Amino acid sequence: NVAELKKSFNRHLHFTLVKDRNVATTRDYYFALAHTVRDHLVGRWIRTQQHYYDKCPKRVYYLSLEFYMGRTLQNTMINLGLQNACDEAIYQLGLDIEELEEIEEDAGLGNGGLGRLAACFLDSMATLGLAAYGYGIRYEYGIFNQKIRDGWQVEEADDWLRYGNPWEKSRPEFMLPVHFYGKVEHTNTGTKWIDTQVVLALPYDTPVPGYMNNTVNTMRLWSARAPDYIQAVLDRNLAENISRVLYPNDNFFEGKELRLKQEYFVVAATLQDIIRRFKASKFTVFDAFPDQVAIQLNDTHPALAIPELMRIFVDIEKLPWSKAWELTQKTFAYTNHTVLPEALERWPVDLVEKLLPRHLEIIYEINQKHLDRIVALFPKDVDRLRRMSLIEEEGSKRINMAHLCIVGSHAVNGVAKIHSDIVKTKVFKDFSELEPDKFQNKTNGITPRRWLLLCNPGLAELIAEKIGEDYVKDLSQLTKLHSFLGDDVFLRELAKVKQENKLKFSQFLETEYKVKINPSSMFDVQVKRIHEYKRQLLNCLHVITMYNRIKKDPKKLFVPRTVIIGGKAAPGYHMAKMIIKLITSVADVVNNDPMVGSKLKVIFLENYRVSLAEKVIPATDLSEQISTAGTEASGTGNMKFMLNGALTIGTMDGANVEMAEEAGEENLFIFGMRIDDVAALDKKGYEAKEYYEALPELKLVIDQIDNGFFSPKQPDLFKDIINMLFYHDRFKVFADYEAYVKCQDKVSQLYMNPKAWNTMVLKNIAASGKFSSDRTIKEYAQNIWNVEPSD
Amino acid sequence: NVAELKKSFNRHLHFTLVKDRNVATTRDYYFALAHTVRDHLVGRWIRTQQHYYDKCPKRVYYLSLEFYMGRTLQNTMINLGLQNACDEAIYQLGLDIEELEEIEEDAGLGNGGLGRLAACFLDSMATLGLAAYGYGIRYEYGIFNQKIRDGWQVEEADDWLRYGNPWEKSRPEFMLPVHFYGKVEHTNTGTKWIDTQVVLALPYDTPVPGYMNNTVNTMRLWSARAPDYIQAVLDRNLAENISRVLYPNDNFFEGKELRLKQEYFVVAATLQDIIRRFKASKFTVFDAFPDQVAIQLNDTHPALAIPELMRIFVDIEKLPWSKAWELTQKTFAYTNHTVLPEALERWPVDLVEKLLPRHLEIIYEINQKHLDRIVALFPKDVDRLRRMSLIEEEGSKRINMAHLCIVGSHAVNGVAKIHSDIVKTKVFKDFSELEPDKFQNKTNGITPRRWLLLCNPGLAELIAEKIGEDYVKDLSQLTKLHSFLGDDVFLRELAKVKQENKLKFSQFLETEYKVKINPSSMFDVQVKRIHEYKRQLLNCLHVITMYNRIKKDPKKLFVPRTVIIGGKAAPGYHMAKMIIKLITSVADVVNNDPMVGSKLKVIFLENYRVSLAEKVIPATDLSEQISTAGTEASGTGNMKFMLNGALTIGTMDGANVEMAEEAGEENLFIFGMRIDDVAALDKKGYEAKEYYEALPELKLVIDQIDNGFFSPKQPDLFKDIINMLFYHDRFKVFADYEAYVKCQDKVSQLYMNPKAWNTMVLKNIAASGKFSSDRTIKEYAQNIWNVEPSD
Ligand SMILES: COc1ccc(O)cc1NC(=O)NC(=O)c1ccc(F)cc1Cl
Ligand SMILES: COc1ccc(O)cc1NC(=O)NC(=O)c1ccc(F)cc1Cl
Ligand SMILES: *Cc1c(COP(=O)(O)O)cnc(C)c1O
Ligand SMILES: *Cc1c(COP(=O)(O)O)cnc(C)c1O
Ligand SMILES: OC[C@H]1O[C@H](O)[C@H](O)[C@@H](O)[C@@H]1O
Ligand SMILES: OC[C@H]1O[C@H](O)[C@H](O)[C@@H](O)[C@@H]1O
């Protein structure tokens, strides 16, 4: 009740924060509420983990280097059914709950979609009552805080743990040793890994509350600790550096030794903990291991788990190779997230030989047995051997981590129908021919808790008033909103909810940027990590085309827009940082032009993260999902926008294909080249200058960027962009330009008719049910992990 | 009460530790009790700090680089009067309180006497109800954990904060910036220190409960925080390294740049915090500053506080030099703890110019106004100018921090009557001649809470049963125990308390060391930091003399002894490490000799720290305080042993003189040369060869060490010890040998007469009253700080 929540808050402010109402800060009030909310899940947290020990169901271990959790206060209150009572408790005490919630730092331990998928999955697995654990690294610094200085991206350290974290709880008794370097000794006692450097792994447990049930699961994150005198003590920082910072690479492989250290650190600590828990349970002694343990590999990042489990089985537990291999394959499952060559992990053998010598011997041994099996099936095909090998012998010998994951797992999955098909029939064609039942599809999803109930209370309330509150546990029930198709009362209520969200977010934009936002404008948003494949550059070419159309004929009819493009660029990604400079330079010319005025405003939304995503998404009218066909594995941003009342402009890529299947192709703004048309242009050879010389609209845009219209001080500034666009554009920006601007004209035409726009929005929300991560998890549960959703 | 404490423990185990009785650890139980005990302090902690804000009494700021606090649980339970109730509550829950207490890490943020004095002072200031604050550094690693491997000292990092500290609380709102490096500009708007490197200072508050009163003061400890991308984030460790580790130097100056960074870090953060609190209180505005603030400099370590207070006053607060200097002198007071030349802080001007350019300018200007006065008073004395200068011109220019401290303070004090005299009349003679009223004496003391009530509940109970409990707050009441000299039953009750403590500690010695302890043996103990001045070597010579006496005549009457020598040696101190190996080598030969047996046992007490001092001191019969006359400033270990029922064997050095004055010289075992006799041997010339050939017992001892009787596998191992003893011994070990062995024979004779021994013990305990830190703090309060005790 309300009275006990106030009493608990006051008890925490006094005893935990050591303050009275006279000198307490807003931060003290946030902590007092956080501790009060955490206290309310303790009973269910203990009981859930006790239940798993007592009944011994098959456990699911989600092993990831990334968990993009965001803020947990409001999420926990909603899932526990305590939001209304806490809101009232805080009000009665004369405080503002929005002010307290804003103090919380995001647990930004992820780069983008991959890390967010892991977070949505934890929420879904707990809601479904599965015996699931999330395993990762407790990075002291998550994804950097982004600032825009003089039009460029600047990085600031994300010191999220500065003032503490009230959600985590250290588990001292489960501290484990992780070994590095050393050498291999082949004695008569067996194979030993000696002379190693030890780094301790201290686990921290964070609660994962299920939506309105009695389940509270665990996310276990590991922190690295160390096991002239002053210098020896200062050098302890080197061991602790393993869990210091998240590598800010999204869909890009950077082969640094510290990243390999992180990957092994989480793998070794996690596997030892899982084996310890297995041995402590009610269950030669490992025959029942895959019937009790399922470990999911989120990308190839924790691929080292395969030879590490083999190392524990063969070297420590003394199990013979063949049995150890059978058990390993049945335990692991791998999820592929990209087909891009630069995003694939290929670790140099020399680096792995130095850091993990025993693991390299095991990888070689796995490759030996794998290749000997292909010789027995195909003796005359010599090229299939080097193509299927885990080792790439060309010049500098590297280990293909994707191939290691395929041979060491019983199931390999993609993240959307179109993607899983390319993974199966194209990229790993040789593997899928040998074992057809290994490769499968698991279309991505998002949690309707954080991505609807939390972020958009207005739309959540609207839907509940019309079709009932049953849609949260079964999102397919959103189809019942079709009963209101001709109803002008509902279409006006839907637009009013969108307007309330737009007005709230416009207040944020005017305080952070010097801009006068037009309240009647179409919120055109592209928020995702900055990449050449995601094509924020194509969006920028359209913003310039619109600017050039207004300057040509000022008194002509133009549908007002607020173009918001946001996202972080990897610090070492030159081209992405150039795209950001281009967007901010275009923004300064468009926003300060008196002829344009309220017709078009451009905003580069700084520091795009989970909490900001929660604010921008419900305020969006148009969603930009313009990646080149065959490059975006799935995308999850697309599903968030669809659930929140926005229309989608995009290519037939990733999950956009499935969104089009569910809502009806005519209900999305699909344009451009499809998978076959991109492949037909690769065989012919991409000549970018043809589109520049054929389309006059594109010529003026590119000339303005090349001459220095957007940069009068530095006319040679965007030359790296021009040289890429003409000779090295693997993502064919100019090839999709015409179809894009024509499609954007159709979006503008529909916005002028509120009734038709909102009828299309209704069809998108009503068909967004398949995109619940609850659906995605039920499929992984039935066809991969072999676990049953309990209530 | 008991039932309420059990409920609170259970509540904490559930909500704070997330555990039930089935999986709860010993660590979990400690934390649950710790939080239960801390909760009982909260109300009085808020009320005490609120009282200081509301009434504004004169505040005392004890500024120190060291706070050797030890464990907090038992101390807090005793000071709040909850120990008996907690012991009962824990027993009823089926647990042992002593087991839970052993989990707590010592807050070993000190080296020895200097840091322990600061800790005793905090306990005393809070007991007397003074508005006092302790200000230091929250070292991530305190004094190293000492391990003995192959007879040598090995250092291990003291990772005291790994599992958390329940006795601290971060104060986010009081985070302050500290500046380093940069350059100085003297503009028309005042002097500006610009282009600096910033390191943030985050304060952590720890409660300091007064004994059985309403006062709970604060100990504020500062932690350093920082304000290729990956490398930039990792390089944040460099700023954090300032508060990483305590410099393990006891009475030794090591001129490392990191130590200077630490000294300024604590000073800047402390002074900025004091000024903020002053300006935020009820009532030019800085005229009342010295009447509201008193800052005590614990050694020269925080000497930079003088030019820093001048910097804030002149550069930031825009006060003129003359007024700024007047206030600075009346604010500061300096406590000298050193006698040795190598212990004095003499920082190179080049190091100070690079790091703190503005402070050097202020130090130069202080020196100029200082030297101009000496030219105006004594014109024809040019040698007095270079002697009194804050700058040493000899070779590479250095700043004499002791001279800076004297001129910038209104009061200077030594720590014992003999020390203060040498500080006044000899070392700083030139300063005392100009200002006699500045130099004072403040004889050291120890808190009877930790050093009697805590460590020796049996003796504390016995004393309370006879004379009441008023002695805890006024230790001079122990004089009433003189009335019980002819009381045979009380003498027997006193002897039993000692035997029960010896039995309890003998259990510790049998568990940690593989040695059989004789219960009827005399516990001969020398525990303090290892140094040549303290003469652990002189003790070692006597141990070998006793060994030889048993080997020459096995049937002779020998009084059994258990000689315990313990203490840490500084890592870079070679001679101290050689002395440790000599003791362990002697131990292995003596303990394993069948002809000796239960007659003599030697133990090198490993990892001597505050918690271990609490165990060994109450179990001691003979206290060794054998430093060379004129080398130990005071000593505090001497006082702890006297209060705990042990007799003292020592020289007339430091506070040993005053212990003899209080108890009667015939009641202590005083030997050797005094201050005047050491000076007479320095004048003639010390020849250690004379005492070697004149004494036959010393000849056998030195031949055994040089020939390798204690090191058969390495005959030339103790070559450095023999070379030092004969040619380079500034502490004249051989000159005190004869008088020491003769005095030790007298100790042995008295031990054979329990009635005479215990009567002498009673005369020592009954006269230990002056040595309470309450008496010391009352004198600092009256004669230096101008504050009044209240309740
Ligand atoms: C200056 O202290 C206060 C003055 C007036 C008040 O109404 C309250 C306070 N202080 C207070 O409420 N708390 C503290 O002072 C405090 C906070 C944190 C901590 F670790 C220790 C304390 Cl004693
Ligand atoms: C394995 O979990 C348990 C099994 C049986 C029990 O009687 C109790 C437990 N667990 C328990 O009491 N607590 C926890 O499991 C726990 C401890 C710390 C933390 F951070 C989270 C949890 Cl859920
Ligand atoms: C959902 C989400 C993403 C993934 O977006 P895509 O558009 O699918 O790449 C990235 N970042 C944040 C902060 C998100 O919430
Ligand atoms: C009291 C004490 C000291 C100081 O001892 P002296 O014998 O005075 O040098 C040093 N270390 C510890 C741990 C102490 O308790
Ligand atoms: O699978 C989760 C996400 O992983 C990666 O971020 C992919 O680029 C994205 O398409 C996918 O949605
Ligand atoms: O003043 C406290 C202590 O400071 C130093 O440690 C001195 O060496 C010691 O003699 C003194 O007792």
Find out whether B270 and B181 touch, Cβ atoms under 8 Å: no
Distance between CA atoms of residues B377 and B379, nearest Å: 6
- Kindly state the tokens that stand for A202: 């201290």
Pick left, alpha or beta for residue B151 (phi over 0 → left; psi -120 to 50 → alpha; otherwise beta): left
The closest of A109, A79, A134 to A296, measured between CA atoms, is A134
Three-class SS state of A534? coil
The closest of B761, B728, B734 to B747, measured between CA atoms, is B761
Experimental method: X-ray
Residues 6 or more apart whose Cβ sits within 8 Å of residue A506: A517, A519, A619
Q: Per-domain residue ranges for chain B?
A: 1-445+773-789, 446-772
- Kindly state the tokens that stand for B429: 């003679």
User: In this structure, which residue's CA is closest to atom 4 in ligand 5?
Assistant: A114
* Inter-chain Cβ pairs, chain A and chain B, closer than 8 A: 91
Contacts of A237 in chain B (CB under 8 A): 237, 241
Secondary element (H or E) of residue A601: strand A600-605
The CA-to-CA distance between both ends of chain A, in Å, stands at: 25
Query: B22: exposed, middle or buried (C-beta count within 10 Å: 0-12, 13-18, 19+)?
Result: exposed
Distance between CA atoms of residues A445 and B458, nearest Å: 68
- Kindly state the tokens that stand for A107: 């647990």
Three-class SS state of A599? helix
The residue length of chain A stands at: 791
Q: Is A635 in the pocket of ligand 5 (CB under 6 A)?
A: yes
Best of A4, A10, A18, A48 to disrupt the B interface (most B CBs within 10 Å) is A18
Structure letter (DSSP) for residue A705: H
Alpha helices in B447-605 (DSSP H): 457-467, 488-512, 536-552, 574-591
Of A39, A169, A244, the CB nearest to B234: A244
Three-class SS state of B24? coil
Same fold, B1-445+773-789 and B446-772: yes
The closest of B581, B521, B571, B558 to B713, measured between CA atoms, is B581
- Kindly state the tokens that stand for B545: 């003399």
Distance between CA atoms of residues A103 and B6, nearest Å: 35
Contact across the interface for B230 and A258, Cβ inside 8 Å: yes
Residues 6 or more apart whose Cβ sits within 8 Å of residue A584: A148, A151, A152, A604
Angle between helices A42-55 and B2-15 (to 10 degrees): 70
Residues 6 or more apart whose Cβ sits within 8 Å of residue A165: A107
Of A234, A244, A247, the CB nearest to B244: A234
Angle between helices A574-591 and A536-552 (to 10 degrees): 20
Q: How many CA atoms lie within 13 A of B43 on its CB side?
A: 7
Distance between CA atoms of residues B674 and B736, nearest Å: 10
- Kindly state the tokens that stand for B512: 């940690």
Best of B21, B234, B235, B259 to disrupt the A interface (most A CBs within 10 Å) is B234
Secondary element (H or E) of residue B153: strand B152-156
Report chain breaks in chain A, C–N > 2.5 Å, as residues after which they occur: 227, 283
Q: Is A250 in the pocket of ligand 2 (CB under 6 A)?
A: no
Distance from CA of B764 to the nearest CA of A (A): 41
Find out whether B743 and B649 touch, Cβ atoms under 8 Å: yes
Secondary element (H or E) of residue A207: strand A197-209
User: Buried (b) or exposed (e) across A334-347, using 16+ Cβ within 10 A?
Assistant: bbbbbbbeebbbbb
Three-class SS state of A625? strand
Secondary element (H or E) of residue B479: none
Pick left, alpha or beta for residue A94 (phi over 0 → left; psi -120 to 50 → alpha; otherwise beta): left
Question: What kind of architecture, by CATH, is found in domain B446-772?
Answer: 3-Layer(aba) Sandwich (3.40)
Query: Which ligand 3 atom lies nearest to the CA of residue A640?
Result: 1
Q: Which long-range contacts (CB under 8 A, 24 or more apart) does B35-38 make?
A: B35/B166, B36/B5, B36/B8, B36/B9, B36/B12, B36/B86, B37/B73, B37/B76, B37/B77, B37/B80, B37/B82, B37/B86, B38/B76, B38/B166, B38/B167, B38/B207
Amino acid at A644: N
Report chain breaks in chain B, C–N > 2.5 Å, as residues after which they occur: 227, 283
Secondary element (H or E) of residue A619: none
Secondary element (H or E) of residue A716: none
The closest of B790, B774, B676 to B124, measured between CA atoms, is B774
Query: Which ligand 4 atom lies nearest to the CA of residue B608?
Result: 13
Distance between CA atoms of residues A621 and A612, nearest Å: 16
HEC letters along B698-766: HHHHHHHHHHCCCCCCCCCCCHHHHHHHHHCCCCCHHHHHHHHHHHHHHHHHHHCCHHHHHHHHHHHHC
Find out whether B515 and B603 touch, Cβ atoms under 8 Å: yes
Residues belonging to the binding site of A for AMP are 20-22, 53, 276
B10 lies within 8 A of chain A by CB:
no
Residues of A labelled catalytic: 337, 528-529, 534, 636, 640
Resolution of the PDB structure in angstroms: 1.9
Residues 6 or more apart whose Cβ sits within 8 Å of residue A661: none
Query: A125: exposed, middle or buried (C-beta count within 10 Å: 0-12, 13-18, 19+)?
Result: buried
Find out whether A623 and A525 touch, Cβ atoms under 8 Å: yes
Residues 6 or more apart whose Cβ sits within 8 Å of residue B765: B459, B463, B478, B481, B642, B643, B645
Three-class SS state of A98? helix
Amino acid at A782: Q
**For A1-445+773-789, CATH number?**
3.40.50.2000
Angle between helices B26-39 and B2-15 (to 10 degrees): 120
Three-class SS state of B175? coil
Amino acid at B342: E
Whether residue B20 is annotated as binding a ligand: the answer is: yes
The CA-to-CA distance between both ends of chain B, in Å, stands at: 24
Neighbours of A612 (CB within 10 A): 18
- Kindly state the tokens that stand for B485: 């000299």
The DSSP code sequence of B608-646 is --HHHHHHHGGG-SEEEE-PPTTT-S--SHHHHHHHTT-
Find out whether A80 and A209 touch, Cβ atoms under 8 Å: yes
HEC letters along B305-364: HHHHHHHHHHHHCCCCHHHHHHHHHHHEEEECCCCCHHHCCEEEHHHHHHHCHHHHHHHH
Residues 6 or more apart whose Cβ sits within 8 Å of residue A264: A178, A180, A304, A308, A355, A356, A359
Residues within 8 A of A (CB atoms), B 12-51 only:
14-15, 17-20, 25, 27, 39, 42-43, 45-46, 50
Find out whether B218 and B133 touch, Cβ atoms under 8 Å: yes
Residues within 8 A of B (CB atoms), A 515-534 only:
none
The DSSP code sequence of B210-260 is PTTSS-EEEEEEEEEE---HHHHHHTTHHHHGGGTB----SS-----HHHH
Best of B46, B200, B230, B254 to disrupt the A interface (most A CBs within 10 Å) is B230
Name the one residue in this structure whose structure tokens are 């968990």. A67
Find out whether A761 and A647 touch, Cβ atoms under 8 Å: yes
Three-class SS state of A775? helix
The DSSP code sequence of B255-313 is --HHHHHHHHHHHHHHHHHHHHHHHTS-----TTGGGTEEEEEESSTTTTHHHHHHHII
Contact across the interface for A164 and B155, Cβ inside 8 Å: no
- Kindly state the tokens that stand for B785: 């700080």
Residue A40 CA: distances (Å) to CA of A82, A87, A92, B18, B19: 9, 15, 20, 11, 14
The closest of B737, B726, B670, B743 to B697, measured between CA atoms, is B737
The closest of B440, B478, B476, B443 to B460, measured between CA atoms, is B478
Query: A602: exposed, middle or buried (C-beta count within 10 Å: 0-12, 13-18, 19+)?
Result: buried
Find out whether A669 and A621 touch, Cβ atoms under 8 Å: no
Structure letter (DSSP) for residue A145: E
Angle between helices A737-751 and A536-552 (to 10 degrees): 60
Strand arrangement of the beta sheet that strand B346-348 belongs to: B346-348, B398-400, B391-392
Neighbours of A189 (CB within 10 A): 7
Find out whether A315 and A192 touch, Cβ atoms under 8 Å: yes
The closest of B651, B154, B696, B226 to A161, measured between CA atoms, is B226
Distance between CA atoms of residues B763 and B775, nearest Å: 20
Distance between CA atoms of residues B755 and B294, nearest Å: 49
Angle between helices A457-467 and A488-512 (to 10 degrees): 170
Distance between CA atoms of residues B257 and B352, nearest Å: 9
How far, in Å, is the centroid of ligand 2 from the Cα of A706?
63
Name the one residue in this structure whose structure tokens are 């309220």. A598
The residue length of chain B stands at: 791
